[PDB]
Design an enzyme around this catalytic site. Structure first.
Site, PDB file in Angstrom:
ATOM      1  N   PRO A   1     -49.872 -59.910  97.975  1.00 54.13           N
ATOM      2  CA  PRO A   1     -50.060 -57.884  97.666  1.00 54.13           C
ATOM      3  C   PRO A   1     -49.032 -57.692  96.682  1.00 54.13           C
ATOM      4  CG  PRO A   1     -49.012 -57.942  99.793  1.00 54.13           C
ATOM      5  CD  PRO A   1     -49.284 -59.158  99.269  1.00 54.13           C
ATOM      6  N   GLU A   2     -48.933 -57.096  95.083  1.00 55.32           N
ATOM      7  CA  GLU A   2     -47.962 -56.434  94.099  1.00 55.32           C
ATOM      8  C   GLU A   2     -48.119 -55.099  94.139  1.00 55.32           C
ATOM      9  OE1 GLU A   2     -49.502 -57.918  90.665  1.00 55.32           O
ATOM     10  OE2 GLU A   2     -51.045 -59.503  91.341  1.00 55.32           O
ATOM     11  N   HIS A  91     -53.853 -64.797 113.318  1.00 54.67           N
ATOM     12  CA  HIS A  91     -52.922 -64.794 112.289  1.00 54.67           C
ATOM     13  C   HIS A  91     -52.455 -63.411 112.826  1.00 54.67           C
ATOM     14  CE1 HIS A  91     -54.196 -68.428 110.799  1.00 54.67           C
ATOM     15  NE2 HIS A  91     -54.746 -67.850 110.740  1.00 54.67           N
ATOM     16  N   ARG A 109     -50.600 -67.073 106.151  1.00 54.82           N
ATOM     17  CA  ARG A 109     -49.404 -68.292 105.601  1.00 54.82           C
ATOM     18  C   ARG A 109     -48.630 -68.446 106.000  1.00 54.82           C
ATOM     19  NH1 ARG A 109     -50.792 -69.416  99.119  1.00 54.82           N
ATOM     20  NH2 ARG A 109     -49.871 -71.365  99.793  1.00 54.82           N
TER      21      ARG A 109
END
Ligand SMILES: [Zn+2]
Length: 271
Positions: A1-2, A91, A109
């Site tokens: 996210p930004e 995850h 990730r």
DNA sequence: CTCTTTGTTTCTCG
DNA sequence: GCGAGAAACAAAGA
């Protein structure tokens, strides 16, 4: 996210978990706690969440009177508020369990990080990261911005991504900002004239504030906090390769700039 | 099967 | 110092 997506998560967490006592903390991937998971579990179990702040793309849990949990979601991190009986998902890595639900952190990730520091260490922490100003009219001083751009031969897109000129832009909003300000992403910053820098400065503030207002950009639908955004419907170039520029009708092109996929209009953003 | 791509950050290398 | 390239990691698409 930004930054807009992290701010959206921050606001949702502020509404829902402030005042909650942490009953227990569990990890299936303890190594993402860079300050040590067992240490964090010992320190934070039984403490009450007092607030949630943000600096740049970093989330800051304010826990107890003296603890700050600094969380970075990196590329794929996602928080969700789940029932205590919620099944594990593949995850999921960490959970804070409350009396009536739990806050689960997932990250496909495994890039996201947690760091437990004290209240008086937060400002030094971000000074050490060299994070630039928040993208607000109050904090983002155009004069210093202009001086830094004048001095550099860096390309504007990579320089903006550094977080040092201003905090919070990532690949989506840097591409969007540069299209809005009519600047090519490979432009060396010392070639930008004052009026271009002014438009860039204002465009950074305007598009990030717009993105915040619209709840961030959800590129894919997801089932987590900050996933009901609408700003993806406002994107003009990011992921729009081959579609027409809304201003001039030229096809949006995609190139690679300093290792990043880069979307621009070749007419509006002259090289 | 390989190679590339992906909302971030931070490293080595020369 | 700098840029280029890559790694941390997982999944999807060509
Ligand atoms: Zn155009």
């Amino acid at each position: 996210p930004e930054l807009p997506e992290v701010e959206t998560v921050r606001r949702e967490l502020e509404k829902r978990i402030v005042g909650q006592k942490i009953i227990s903390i569990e990890a299936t991937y303890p190594r993402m706690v860079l300050t040590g998971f067992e240490q964090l579990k010992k320190e934070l179990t039984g403490k009450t969440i007092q607030g949630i702040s943000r600096r740049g793309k970093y989330l800051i849990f304010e826990i107890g009177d003296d603890f700050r949990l600094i969380s970075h979601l990196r590329m794929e991190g996602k928080y969700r508020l789940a029932t205590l009986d919620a099944p594990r998902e593949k995850h999921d890595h960490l959970t804070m369990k409350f009396a009536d639900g739990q806050l689960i952190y997932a990250d496909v990730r495994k890039f996201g990080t947690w760091e437990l520091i004290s209240t008086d260490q937060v400002l030094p922490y971000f000074l050490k990261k060299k994070i630039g100003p928040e993208p607000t009219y109050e904090d983002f001083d155009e004069k210093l911005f202009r001086e830094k751009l004048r001095k550099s031969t860096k390309k504007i897109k990579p320089y903006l991504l550094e977080q040092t000129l201003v905090a919070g832009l990532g690949n989506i909003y840097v591409d969007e900002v540069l299209w809005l300000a009519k600047i090519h992403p490979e432009k060396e910053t010392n070639q930008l004239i004052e009026s271009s820098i002014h438009l860039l400065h204002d465009s950074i503030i305007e598009i990030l504030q717009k993105a915040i207002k619209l709840g961030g950009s959800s590129i894919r639908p997801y089932s987590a906090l900050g996933s009901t955004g609408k700003m993806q419907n406002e994107l003009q170039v990011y992921g729009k390769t081959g579609e027409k520029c809304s201003r001039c009708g030229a096809e949006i092109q995609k190139i690679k700039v300093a290792g990043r996929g880069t979307h621009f209009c070749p007419v509006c953003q002259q090289k």
